[PDB]
């Protein structure tokens, strides 16, 4: 048979991502703020990791002011202006530290799947209105405020998929989805060519919690002779059902662009 290896497979690599990864690593290691009461180094974020280990949490909170003063602010600029590019590298950076100091947190008896950590930020410099969202800011890190008007029920979102062939006993794993439901391109076993009749293995695949909420501008802020605009916001993970209709809330994240699926 005409077996052949992918000799040419060696990939292109982004140097900025790795340097950001292993600088954020150092920030997590040794931010080294002194105690609230004394001149003694406390290392608050390692303590927060220990806290998460104690209570089996899955999210970590970071102060933007702490990141601003680190290493002349270049890292904070890179995270702020290109969040969408650098978010995977930050995850890779945090995984190594949690492995180093609290390997019990890496897993969620049979084998246990990995924990999907979440990084969170707060205390950003300024808050924008819904009226200030503009396409030049796509992919950046922002904060927004408004009044909630609707909320959706919690739904499961497919995060990573795994499929098995009908015509032969073969399995495909770790397929990536993005915005539309996506399926493999070939049968991996070369003894079979069937592309049809895949089935999604619900056990092996992994899901996420997902909620839609809708907001409108604060009444006291509306300009002269105008009427309030609205926006749709996505909530995921441990923050679903936190919002309530009729309440006033403040959000933070990144604005994105959604296709016509």
């Amino acid at each position: 048979f005409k077996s052949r290896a992918l000799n040419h497979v060696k990939k292109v690599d982004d140097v900025t991502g790795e340097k950001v990864r292993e600088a954020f690593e150092q920030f997590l290691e040794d931010f080294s703020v002194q105690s609230t009461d004394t001149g003694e180094v406390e290392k608050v974020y390692r303590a927060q990791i220990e806290f998460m280990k104690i209570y089996d949490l899955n999210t970590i909170y970071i102060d933007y002011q702490h990141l601003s003063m680190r290493e002349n602010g270049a890292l904070a600029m890179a995270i702020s202006e290109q969040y969408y590019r650098f978010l995977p590298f930050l995850q890779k950076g945090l995984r190594r530290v949690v492995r180093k100091y609290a390997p019990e947190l890496l897993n969620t008896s049979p084998e246990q799947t990995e924990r999907v950590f979440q990084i969170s930020f707060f205390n950003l410099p300024t808050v924008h209105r819904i009226r200030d969202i503009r396409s030049e800011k796509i992919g950046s890190l922002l904060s927004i405020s408004g009044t909630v008007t609707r909320t959706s029920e919690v739904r499961p979102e497919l995060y990573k998929a795994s499929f098995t062939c009908d015509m032969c006993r073969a399995i495909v794993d770790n397929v990536e989805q993005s915005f539309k439901y996506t399926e493999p391109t070939f049968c991996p076993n070369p003894s079979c060519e069937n592309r049809a009749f895949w089935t999604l293995n619900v056990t092996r695949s992994r899901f996420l919690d997902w909620q839609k909420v809708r907001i409108q501008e604060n009444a006291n802020e509306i300009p002269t002779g105008s009427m309030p605009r609205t926006l749709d916001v996505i909530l995921r993970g441990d923050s679903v059902e936190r919002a309530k209709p009729g309440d006033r809330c403040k959000f933070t994240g990144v604005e994105i662009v959604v296709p016509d699926v």
């Binding site: 008896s109 049979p110 084998e111 919690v154 499961p156 619900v202 056990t203 899901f207 919690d209």
Partner: protein
């Protein structure tokens, strides 16, 4: 094939997941034997085997559903209760195929009355409203309460894909 496991041998899940461990032949045969041994043997404090009495009344009413209390199944052979909580869709298949043997021990040729029996679980010891359900609950057994808002009419549905049907609503 021939050899069987002990109940202590099932304490260690040896495959990568529960469902891939229940579905193996020797493990499945061991579970079937243990469930049959539980159903024929459980007692009140007064003796007075409850499930022998319930199988007796199953035929008296020409019925189709046997009812099993979860607390009884948890009081002895606890690992089976754990597996039932984790993988109901497999465990109930095995349990139904055991229940038919138990009923035919009382009433031979009950297959001519009904071809298949369903096990109903009762007193599951944890409860959710419709708020607390999350993606982690998928394929797990749950207990829920509420008000029934709307009801469709009854229809038949094709059972297998010679033909057989079942009711649906």
């Amino acid at each position: 094939l021939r050899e069987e496991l002990t109940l202590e041998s099932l304490s260690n899940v040896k495959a990568n997941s529960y469902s891939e461990w229940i579905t193996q032949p020797n493990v499945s045969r061991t579970i079937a034997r243990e469930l049959k041994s539980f159903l024929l043997e459980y007692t009140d404090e007064t003796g007075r085997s409850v499930y022998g009495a319930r199988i007796r009344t199953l035929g008296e009413m020409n019925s189709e559903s046997l009812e099993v209390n979860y607390r009884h199944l948890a009081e002895s052979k606890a690992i089976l209760a754990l597996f039932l909580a984790k993988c109901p869709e497999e465990m109930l298949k095995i349990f139904d195929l055991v229940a038919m043997e138990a009923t035919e021990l009382h009433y031979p040729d009950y297959a001519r009355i009904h071809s298949e029996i369903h096990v109903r679980i009762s007193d599951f010891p944890t409860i959710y409203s419709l708020r607390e359900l999350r993606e982690s609950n998928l394929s797990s057994l749950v207990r829920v309460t509420g008000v029934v808002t709307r009801r469709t009419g009854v229809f038949p549905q094709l059972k297998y894909v010679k033909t057989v049907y079942r009711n649906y609503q």
